[PDB]
């Protein structure tokens, strides 16, 4: 039954760790997947994580099963980060919460959810975007149709042709924006773009789907989340898939949170019950340490207080080796000007390189870079610095 | 977008959890979903896995994204377990296992899987058989049919109609197999009938697959899978859904493994790359901590020892509260003979009791158990027999 089945396509992101393991090079420079990197050059575990790990290992009793959404804590914490301790979407118990297996998770969650109970049909996404988004989208028998987003030729968001894409938008299609850190462009819409968004959104009769992955990446953890406050503050419905790998450095535990927002607490409850049942026939239910250790980290003042300076922490540093990364490309020589990207927020330098070049850059130095010409500035340290522009200025 | 959805029917075995949530009574008997209870009625996280986590915990370095398949060590560690440290099938490198968020993920994952790659259009399952097989399958678009099993009135397997059963079933079609310990009938085929259902399999043409959450629970690790192992002597191709919530107390944690057999390593490889395809549209990569317990357990000799006492001291505590079950409604005047209960193999007792008598345990004494009659005998305690059985023989 097996004799012709297809080899499957790589992933341009995911397999990029495939293509590294095979790399016997030495000095090799991984540019590809969006993981945070200290100085030296490693993915520690945060120590506000290992005191949570800690705490569980002393004072957990049991393993038995977790509800279907997973530990209530956990989303209770998630919906405060999200929409604001005192927001009103809390008080009126217009949102639920279910604990998915990291933000992909709950993408697919999301859905499965929207093919199966909603008269959805189409999701949209920007152009560029994060490639799984359309995998995961048509996995679920859903079409993916593309906005215009950023302009090449500027390094900008251009926000005219945005709002002409979205015309052909019809009411009941949903559209998809990320929080903040737009992977791979690092280009967010300003507060008042959100607004006007959020205004359009309403009247065209769209159905909003955050992916928010990067909170606490861009500006602070507030922040970060007032485009969607100011979505959540005019729409009776929406959808927010977010992620705690990043920004707790829980990459494999796969933590994460589908967030259902309806109209009333009556409604929202009918819906998430058919949530459940789409995660019932998936997983069942979520695996508890990563999501433990969130909740026990943002329930806890001490830890929460480590944690949110480690948290600054990351941020600053990659936001040093984005300014590093810039002065060394034009020490070294570089073609063109690169101070674009100093506009850019999040782990990702969205750096303008061809597909050639990037291919280049790993056949002949060793570096790797997404096919886009993404590259992970949180992947750059002042070591691998010198080498990693030579190579650039080497194939401009 | 909302306001049409209708309320989803809830689970009739993960939904018991929330009536017993509701319920506000004192003495409330859980028998239900399929965990673990000492004599405290309580469930424990085991030694073993204590000492683990605490390895881990002293020695991880980072939360890094595992590959999309898991942990390549738990993957060779499964197949060891499934088919025997010397197999062929290992040592042929026929075997691709990819980690996946427990055996309910692993179900989804081979479903996925089955439906996008393959002709298969058909999934036969067993009457009784576990619901969310039935669930499961029906999510990927892929009818189920049932198949003759159990002899309610002689509560027995009844082979003769099995295969007269399954003489319906077409080449192309799946046929699904419970390892051991059926549930919920507790009834498993000897080797003899495993062994001639192997045959008939492989002139059917049938592609077998496994689900294996129970290994060790029927006899002992090696005797419980010699099922799988005849299947895996004749057959060019397997599926294995595997699960290790139940032997190592690890429910939460979502730690299973879907298995894929092909006739070689370049088949294998080849359809092992869509397996991934599927997984990486779904949670993209498997939870870290289950499994790296798991694998620190099952590589170490120290921790293996203890964990697989630890097994035997949970597999003879439910064989005792079988036999204590079975005299105890003798004793307490019981209607009819319930001898057959010793003959069942696993957590279970599929005790004959109508769905009336269910509702009215639950009603009246406060006794939770699953519609169709089962009772998990795992969650009786020298304790909480008494009532139990008084319950019982009230409304025989
Ligand atoms: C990291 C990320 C996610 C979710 O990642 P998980 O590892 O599955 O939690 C989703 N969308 C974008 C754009 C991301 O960068
Ligand atoms: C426990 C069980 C599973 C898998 O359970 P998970 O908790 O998802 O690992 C699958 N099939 C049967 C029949 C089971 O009893």
């Known amino acids: 039954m097996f004799e012709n089945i297809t ?20 000095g090799k420079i991984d540019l590809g997947m969006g993981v945070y990197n200290d100085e030296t050059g490693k993915t520690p575990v945060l120590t506000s994580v290992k005191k949570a790990e800690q705490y ?23 919906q405060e980060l999200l929409f604001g301790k005192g927001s ?25 959810f929207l093919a199966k109970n909603t008269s959805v049909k189409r999701v949209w996404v920007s152009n560029p975007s994060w490639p799984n988004h359309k995998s995961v989208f048509n996995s679920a ?16 968001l251009d926000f005219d042709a945005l709002i002409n894409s979205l015309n052909e938008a019809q009411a ?3 559209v998809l924006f990320h929080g903040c850190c737009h992977n791979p462009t690092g280009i967010d819409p300003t507060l008042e773009q959100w607004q006007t968004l959020a205004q359009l959104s309403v009247e065209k009769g769209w159905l909003p789907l955050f992916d928010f992955a990067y909170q606490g ?37 796969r933590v994460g949170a589908c967030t259902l927002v309806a109209a009333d607490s009556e409604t929202v409850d009918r819906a998430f019950s058919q949530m459940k049942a789409a995660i019932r026939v998936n997983y069942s239910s979520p695996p508890a340490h990563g999501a433990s250790v969130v909740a026990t980290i943002l329930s806890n003042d001490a830890l929460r207080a480590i944690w949110e300076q480690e948290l600054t922490d990351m941020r600053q ?6 300014q ?28 303008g390189l061809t597909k050639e070049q990037v291919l280049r850059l790993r056949e002949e130095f060793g570096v790797y870079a997404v096919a886009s010409g993404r590259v992970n500035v949180a992947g750059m340290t002042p070591d691998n610095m010198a080498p990693l522009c030579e190579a650039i200025v080497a194939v401009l």
């Not at 028998?141 to 900008?156: I, K, S």
């Open 172 to 174: 009941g299609d949903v």
């Open 324 to 351: 590093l990364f810039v002065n060394t490309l034009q020490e070294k020589g570089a073609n063109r000007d690169f101070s674009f990207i100093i506009k850019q927020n999040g782990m990702f330098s969205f750096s």
């Open 56 to 78: 569980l290992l002393e004072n957990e009793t049991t393993k038995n099963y977790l509800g279907i959404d997973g530990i209530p804590e956990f989303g209770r914490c998630t």
């Open 88 to 112: 009103a979407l809390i008080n009126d118990k217009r949102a639920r919460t279910a604990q998915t297996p990291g933000g992909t998770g709950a993408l697919r969650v999301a859905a499965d």
């Open 141 to 156: 028998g859903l079409e993916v149709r593309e906005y215009a987003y950023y302009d090449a030729e500027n390094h900008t």
């Open 217 to 253: 990446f861009a500006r602070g953890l507030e922040e970060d989340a007032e485009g969607l406050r100011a979505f959540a503050a005019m729409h009776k419905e929406l959808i927010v898939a977010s992620s705690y790998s990043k920004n707790f450095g829980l990459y494999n535990e």
């Open 317 to 322: 540093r990659i936001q040093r080796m984005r």
């Open 7 to 26: 080899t499957a396509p790589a992933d341009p992101i995911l397999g990029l760790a495939d293509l590294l393991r095979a790399d016997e090079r030495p």
